Ligand binder design. Structure first.
Ligand SMILES: *[C@@H]1O[C@H](CO)[C@@H](O[C@@H]2O[C@H](CO)[C@@H](O[C@@H]3O[C@H](CO[C@H]4O[C@H](CO[C@H]5O[C@H](CO)[C@@H](O)[C@H](O)[C@@H]5O)[C@@H](O)[C@H](O[C@H]5O[C@H](CO)[C@@H](O)[C@H](O)[C@@H]5O)[C@@H]4O)[C@@H](O)[C@H](O[C@H]4O[C@H](CO[C@H]5O[C@H](CO)[C@@H](O)[C@H](O)[C@@H]5O)[C@@H](O)[C@H](O)[C@@H]4O)[C@@H]3O)[C@H](O)[C@H]2NC(C)=O)[C@H](O)[C@H]1NC(C)=O
Ligand code: CA
Length: 467
């Protein structure tokens, strides 16, 4: 174990920034203390019902919110809370269970949360548990190609793909968002097997022709060939792209394959998917066999920070281009917040049918406590220090406090366009792992989890550079 760099949370110099940061910590005490009060040990909290919530993505594993919150608690100086969480994990976190889990979700939340807790604290239990879980996920890769199953029974090792997935195919974002965690699993366990699995994924992908430079969201694990040619930088695709860039950064820039894959991918996305509305907003559309659908998801909004984070490493005279593209995605995504009643954006928003940056379908008007817009504000603040990004982040804080904060915690909303809240009764674990961590960091100095020394996984779990 090596002492971690930049884990001290010194108070900002400006009194107003100090006060704003203290508010975000207070919001975390509200989310955490209510989770502990009504749902301790269960995966998530139902804040209206004041009971536990057990998403099917996690099967019979326990304590998702405990594990997802560990690192946020640590950096906020919540040491009593961190110790209670550690004691529960030592006694009760068990991966020897008989149910199916999403390999992807368990990796980014449980493996990632345990890894960050270990690197921040040095407590060996976190390392031991991360490796235990990695070992349990290894049967997911038992396919003819090495492209893993979506869903794995932890006891039997038997896997399968989503039943609706084109021809029984695996999902790009799912198998493409294992890389960072598996590289650290090999480092800490000394066992090459984890890196071998994620490097085999690379081998399969690089053998395929990418239609127009684009990656279909579906890849069959038996044949190793594409399913239907649906392409998106939001759901089903998003974090695969994210992890190409971050694999390169986290390798101390030695993973040259990752770098080329990333910049090639983003150029094809710019050409075929990125458009400007008649009102002047930049958006990322979805592509289906050549035909654009002029719609962007809240999930897609993470891409603003991705583009900005990759700017420093971009080719000669392309760095400002990517900082500016990041800023335009940030602005569009801020407009999706601005044009609502509650000032929190919808799950999807459109740029045709006579609209710009608003939802039209009733079933896409919801907000489930998502971090991706605030995530992009954090990167834009740290990479430009333009005060507007702190201004926009604080607008979201005031919105959350006005419309999502309830007596029993924080709840998502079913319709951001009307006055009367319709609470969905789920406190998503990613609100504690991501939304509040990124808010806290925005109102901190740059030297708390400095971006030069820490690369965030897709669930806001910071990992150190591997040399
Ligand atoms: C968050 O959301 C808010 C909305 O809540 C956004 O605010 C809007 O921003 C718009 C874009 O900047 C802006 O549109 C411009 O409006 C200018 C006119 O404003 C003045 O007049 C209007 C109208 O008054 C008459 O009509 C009303 C009824 O509508 C009557 O009640 C009056 O008696 C008059 O008869 C006033 O309402 C305005 O006053 C309000 O707004 C002011 C701020 O604008 C406030 O200070 C006031 O207190 C008051 O609330 C003003 O007095 C237009 O001149 C301007 O027109 C240019 O742009 C057009 C659009 O260009 C793009 O799109 C086209 C189409 O695709 C492309 O061709 C172009 O290339 C561009 O891509 C262009 O078509 C024109 O030809 C002109 O070049 C423009 O329409 C809104 O006024 C503003 N609304 C409000 C209420 O504030 C805000 O931007 C969002 N973001 C942020 C960060 O806040
Ligand atoms: Ca993410």
């Amino acid at each position: 174990f090596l002492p971690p760099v930049g884990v001290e949370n010194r108070e900002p110099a400006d009194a107003t920034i100090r006060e704003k940061r203290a508010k975000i910590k207070e919001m975390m005490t509200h989310a955490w203390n209510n989770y502990k009060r009504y749902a301790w040990g269960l995966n998530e909290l139902k804040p209206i019902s004041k009971e536990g919530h057990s998403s099917s993505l996690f099967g019979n594993i326990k304590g998702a919110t405990i594990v997802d919150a560990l690192d946020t608690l640590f950096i906020m100086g919540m040491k009593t809370e961190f110790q209670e969480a550690k004691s529960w994990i030592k006694k009760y976190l068990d991966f020897n269970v008989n149910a199916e889990v999403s390999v992807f979700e368990v990796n980014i939340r449980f493996v990632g949360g345990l890894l960050s807790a270990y690197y921040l604290s040095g407590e060996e239990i976190f390392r031991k548990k991360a490796v235990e879980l990695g070992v349990k996920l290894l049967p997911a890769f038992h396919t003819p190609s090495g492209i893993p199953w979506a869903l794995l029974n932890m006891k039997s090792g038997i896997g399968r793909n989503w039943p609706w997935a084109s021809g029984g195919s695996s999902i790009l974002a799912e198998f493409g968002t294992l890389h960072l965690e598996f590289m650290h699993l090999s480092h800490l366990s000394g066992d090459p097997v984890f890196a071998e699995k994620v490097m085999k994924i690379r081998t399969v992908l690089n053998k395929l022709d990418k239609p127009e430079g684009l990656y279909p969201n579906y890849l069959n694990p038996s044949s190793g060939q594409w399913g239907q040619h649906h392409v998106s930088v939001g759901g089903l695709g998003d974090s695969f792209y994210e992890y190409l860039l971050k694999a390169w950064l986290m390798s101390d820039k030695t993973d040259l394959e990752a770098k080329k894959m990333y910049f090639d991918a983003v150029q094809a996305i710019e050409t075929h998917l990125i458009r400007k509305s008649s009102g002047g907003l930049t958006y990322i559309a979805e592509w289906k066999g050549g035909l654009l659908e002029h719609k962007m998801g809240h999930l897609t909004c993470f891409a603003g920070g991705m583009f900005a984070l990759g700017a420093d490493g971009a080719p000669e005279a392309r760095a400002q281009h990517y900082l500016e593209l990041g800023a335009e995605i940030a602005r569009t995504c801020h407009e999706s917040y601005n044009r609502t009643y509650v000032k929190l954006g919808p799950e999807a928003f459109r740029f045709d049918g006579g609209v710009e940056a608003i939802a039209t379908r009733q079933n896409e008007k919801y907000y489930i406590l998502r971090p991706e817009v605030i995530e992009t504000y954090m990167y834009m603040w740290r990479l430009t220090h333009d005060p507007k990004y702190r201004t926009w982040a604080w607008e979201a804080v005031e919105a959350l406090e006005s419309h999502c904060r309830v007596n029993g915690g924080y709840s998502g909303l079913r319709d951001v366009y009307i006055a009367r809240e319709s609470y969905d009764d789920v406190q998503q674990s990613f609100f504690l792992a991501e939304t509040l961590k990124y808010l806290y960091l925005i109102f901190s100095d740059d030297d708390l989890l400095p971006l030069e020394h820490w690369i965030f996984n897709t669930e806001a779990h910071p990992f150190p550079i591997l040399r």
